[PDB]
Symmetry: C2
Subunit: 180 residues, 2 copies
């Protein structure tokens, strides 16, 4: 499944649009034995979709608002597959046993990627709207022996205006898949 | 799990990109009870992905190349709830029973839309790269009481080169969902 209007949102807290999560989910190639860390503090959209397809998910979020909404969404789809961990991913990550990672939002991508790598995490998906990060992540992963597959995705949404349908875009996003 | 690129390809026969399939599969909102028609002469990417998800799928295709590749992929991924019906959708669709349509390329998109309309199909997703067809699909449907969520997706792929990476553009495609 997937839908977007059936997610509990909250001003100040971002949510991945449906089409983006559909692509990002696919890149993770999730199965029943995957234990996934989901970094970067959002509303829970990706968390739920990941929870629904794997063994267990850690949602690492560092801001209160995000934790709260994710929590509500978790409640809302009856997810018992998931632990929300408040804090910096770089402080937490060492302590966990997992085999895949999705990274959204996040600070210290350079720290996280290095920890991921040395924890022998051999399948990672990262989304970024930022040019410098897209550049970092792709080169960081290729140097650390991953084969990298990145796509820039620019979605625009039909909106009716007096003359007909215009397409409303906001920001393109880079979705990066590193497997090793 | 949207499959990588383990698809049987035969050149002259297009394959819908992985990320475009993930978005279209998402907009279809598949249930195990869905009976889907899949109209479009491609390599079976979409077909397969629809089959894994619903009770049954009918691939409607006029093009021999397309059919055979599609048969091969269906074979490759062990898909058994799918029947291929060789013919022009405009000739056949009106005979079929199903409650959900996916439309890929097709000549005579008006006729097709008329048919889905009459049959009271409450859920249609259509991909097009043709300007005029995107216009007709959206307006024809909005005219018939469907509400229509259309998106345009521009995808580009990082390609490694001596200086770094460039992004090679693929052609943009409009993904139209119509629900009533």
């Amino acid at each position: 499944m997937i839908p977007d209007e059936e997610f509990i949102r909250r001003e100040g807290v971002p949510i991945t649009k449906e089409e983006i999560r559909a692509v990002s989910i696919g890149k993770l190639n999730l199965n029943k034995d995957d234990v996934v860390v989901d970094v970067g503090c959002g509303s829970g959209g990706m968390t739920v979709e990941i929870a629904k397809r794997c063994k267990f998910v850690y949602a690492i979020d560092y801001l209160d608002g995000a934790i709260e909404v994710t929590k509500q969404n978790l409640a809302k789809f009856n997810i018992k597959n998931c632990q929300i961990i408040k804090g910096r991913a770089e402080d937490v990550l060492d302590k966990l046993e997992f085999n895949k990672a999705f990274i959204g939002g996040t600070k210290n991508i350079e720290k996280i990627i290095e920890i991921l790598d040395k924890k022998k995490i051999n399948h990672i998906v990262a989304n970024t709207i930022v040019l410098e990060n897209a550049a970092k992540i792709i080169n960081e992963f290729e140097s650390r022996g991953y084969n990298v597959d990145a796509v820039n995705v620019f979605i625009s949404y039909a909106k009716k205006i007096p003359s007909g349908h215009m397409f409303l875009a906001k920001n393109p996003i880079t979705i990066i898949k590193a497997v090793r």
